[PDB]
Amino acid sequence: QDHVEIIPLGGMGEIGKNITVFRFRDEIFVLDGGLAFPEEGMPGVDLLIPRVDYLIEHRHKIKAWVLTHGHEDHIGGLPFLLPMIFGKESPVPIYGARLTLGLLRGKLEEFGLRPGAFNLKEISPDDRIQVGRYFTLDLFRMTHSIPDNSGVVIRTPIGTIVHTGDFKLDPTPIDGKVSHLAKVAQAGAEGVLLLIADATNAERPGYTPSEMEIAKELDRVIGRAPGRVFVTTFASHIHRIQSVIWAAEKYGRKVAMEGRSMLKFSRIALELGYLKVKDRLYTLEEVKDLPDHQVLILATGSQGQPMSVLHRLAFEGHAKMAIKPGDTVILSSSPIPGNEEAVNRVINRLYALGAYVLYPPTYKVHASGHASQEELKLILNLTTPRFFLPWHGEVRHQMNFKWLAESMSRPPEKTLIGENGAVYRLTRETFEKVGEVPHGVLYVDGLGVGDITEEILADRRHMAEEGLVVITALAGEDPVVEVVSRGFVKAGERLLGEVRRMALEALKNGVREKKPLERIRDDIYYPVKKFLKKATGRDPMILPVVIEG
Amino acid sequence: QDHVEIIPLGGMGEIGKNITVFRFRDEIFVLDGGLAFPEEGMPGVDLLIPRVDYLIEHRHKIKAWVLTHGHEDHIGGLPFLLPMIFGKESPVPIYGARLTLGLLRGKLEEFGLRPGAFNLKEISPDDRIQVGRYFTLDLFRMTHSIPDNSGVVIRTPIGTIVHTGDFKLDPTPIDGKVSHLAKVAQAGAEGVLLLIADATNAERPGYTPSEMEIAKELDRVIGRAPGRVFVTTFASHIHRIQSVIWAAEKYGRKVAMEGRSMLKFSRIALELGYLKVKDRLYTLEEVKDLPDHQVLILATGSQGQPMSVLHRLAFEGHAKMAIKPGDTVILSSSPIPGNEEAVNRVINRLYALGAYVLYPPTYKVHASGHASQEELKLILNLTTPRFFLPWHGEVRHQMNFKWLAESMSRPPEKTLIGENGAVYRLTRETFEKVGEVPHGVLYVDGLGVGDITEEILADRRHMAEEGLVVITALAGEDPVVEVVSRGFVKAGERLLGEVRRMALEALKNGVREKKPLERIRDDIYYPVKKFLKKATGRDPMILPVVIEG
């Protein structure tokens, strides 16, 4: 009769804004609460966060919030999500490792969220915590692109759920902290009911290169740089940042840092001992008049991602720095899903500015923080789950992980492709989607959350693809109709006179018939809509503005 | 004193719409005239063609048009370009190999362009032709993704220009026709003044896989397909089409073909003997009630590219066919530059529809038709040019080819990164950009060329990114102002009342001052523009519609 309910609100069928709800009877615990960065073409938007209607409604049932690591797509939404769910304070335990909470506290500060306003509980990446009456969570350290990263064995009343968390099996991590697989292998031997695993590189054969390999390559290309060196990466990629710092130090270069979020995350990492710097980190101004060959700039965008700073350096221009011939620019991160070709344009432009650009995959200046097939198969054989739920990847990633699992010695009884908002029921003998709950995203820009909406976005697309047709109609005894367009096909642009004309007949009949301005609007809208369709095969946005006299 | 002028009008700093003008004194010859396929997000547009203002102006100076191969980005623009330059007929020699001209004639037919309306001169892929008094062109066969493909040694009064054309050095081509390098090596020993070479895969190490490797892999994955098989590729990829046909035949599958352009190109290839089919090619209807395992569908979009058919199969739906669980879909081509992540979405959706999708680079079901670094270095050492002009690739490709050349035994004296519209002057001792000429693109949709413009496109983007603010103003003794918006930030949406108000003051002052409706429009536009900027940091499109009384 007993069953666990798994409800993803973000992170399924996508890479970003991870948050997964677990529930047994009337006790809930949440795993992460990340944000997702926006794709280009969606200007204005700073970040996306998952809709948590379900948690707001069941807020009093949440017994704890568990955070796996400090990447923005795992804790970036919290400064927004917490207030939405609990208000400006809460007693609910929010567990996380030292670095993870250090970064979280840093973010909360920025939102005026008091320190102890929330109950942050610092734990070990390998800790064991009891959540309410029904959940015993056994965390285990996993190598990833940030220190203090964990997976978790979720022990429930009906069996074990092994959650790999974000991971790769780096044999030689920069901080010397290898993955701890004892709890995972142990659970495998005892019997794993459900496995939830990182599908990011499920389509990639072999093993993901070690962060140390990148460190060595960065060392090489940097020691080869004739003048200045610019390195872009995510602010939360502490391992990469350390690799860069070591490179800069070895060749006598002072490290300057640009990007609010990275200076912040880096300061915190230094205070807590996760980062070490021979000298100290400097600002752009402090290295202003340094010889080109003794300067290395670590930069990212205001929100933590490299895109915005790369784009400004290449196009609109940056107020604090400018690219010049001879400069070496290294993109030490992969593009946000959807920005791949936006990055290529940036690269093209950086080259045209005279810089020597090194970027992946052409140049080995970056390595994924996720496991490739050999690492995934190892985890699959370690756990031999009865049920499988690929996560942290789009449908193709999830599907390729499913195919990978199906080719193992003891394939899972059943594998499901998880979706955001879906409700999965897990029993000792079954696993199935049994419903859905309100889900989605909320858009965030400077002017707060929601300033941008799905509707606003929908109109922008209808606009961007079909154009606009504005019909100005004066409803009086001497009716007037003017039609103008923009971004509309020239062919249709020559049919506006016919538009104006049919709008006039509608306007006159509307008046003569004492109709309300709204039904007159409809009377104009629908006919012109159909006409331009049956005439140009286009669906421009038709804005009928009907004004009395 | 003598010098050759090279003027690219398309194909430089991009992959697509290739056309290059060569000139000595008053005699011109043109190399190709392709089109470029559109990126998604640029809906409505069917194809892009290069602006040929320069050739229209100097039309009487053109002594011949030379076509290297039948790929759309080399001959696809001709049905549009020829009429624009010569009218509906011309005596000017248009040289091309058998297949190349066969496909060209097929295209011209579709535009009502009479057969002999133009002077198509069929030549051998290894021919030698004299162009006017100053040019002797020595063509040489090069393996590529279509039969009858050539590079060309352009012999001029001041030296030799070796143009590689599109190529890879496939050691085992499907048609058994290997590359002919005798003319290239010969020119290298005599001394090559300028080398123009294919930079597509200049950033890729090693050698491009042979089309035969793909043929074998396609054979494997197809023989593994439980039910129907769908294969998408460009209509002009005759080698790939043959590879697929052989696969289908070996496993007793009848081949159906969808996509006007591919049925057409394939018929022509069959008539001319470039394609061989055990049985015959069928239509969708003819294979309607065939067992799933005995059906293979070769498809592409109406214009020759796979995108539109893949998109319909995955989203909006196709009238002639539908994807069903168990179907195997193979994307046997790479995405158009800018469609990479549009393809990923299609793949995700195809998987969600229940099909087994195989696509590159995850699956080896496709191989580039362009040379990788080892093939390029071979060509570089074969020619050892004094001057170098990488072509057929974006800036990063061009730059990486430049770096590759600079690492050779005898680097070029100087390498230039070519641009469309730039004018390069070549003498025996020099090579330099000395000017520019009107250049660009023209957008083409069903309603003909130009139906879509840069302006229309610009407004669509301004619209798509910033939204819209329509201010309706009635200029009379009882002024009226109404403001409405769409795709505009909620924050700004709350400032429309303030907009209306400042528009009213402008409207009233405009009236009271007898100003013309245009200066009143400006008086409303500019202030509101600045206001919303200084208030929301956004630049929405402001459409002030001022109407008398």
Ligand SMILES: O=c1ccn([C@@H]2O[C@H](COP(=O)(O)O)[C@@H](O)[C@H]2O)c(=O)[nH]1
């Ligand atoms: O905080 C982060 C760090 C990385 N990524 C993205 O996750 C994907 C995998 O990163 P990786 O394989 O390069 O480590 C990429 O699309 C990258 O842009 C994020 O969305 N958020």
Ligand SMILES: O=c1ccn([C@@H]2O[C@H](COP(=O)(O)O)[C@@H](O)[C@H]2O)c(=O)[nH]1
């Ligand atoms: O007629 C064609 C054939 C291929 N391509 C494109 O050329 C690039 C290289 O193709 P390939 O390396 O896969 O052969 C790709 O972006 C592909 O979409 C075209 O633009 N036109």
Ligand SMILES: [Zn+2]
């Ligand atoms: Zn992560």
Ligand SMILES: [Zn+2]
């Ligand atoms: Zn993650």
Ligand SMILES: [Zn+2]
């Ligand atoms: Zn080609």
Ligand SMILES: [Zn+2]
């Ligand atoms: Zn080409």
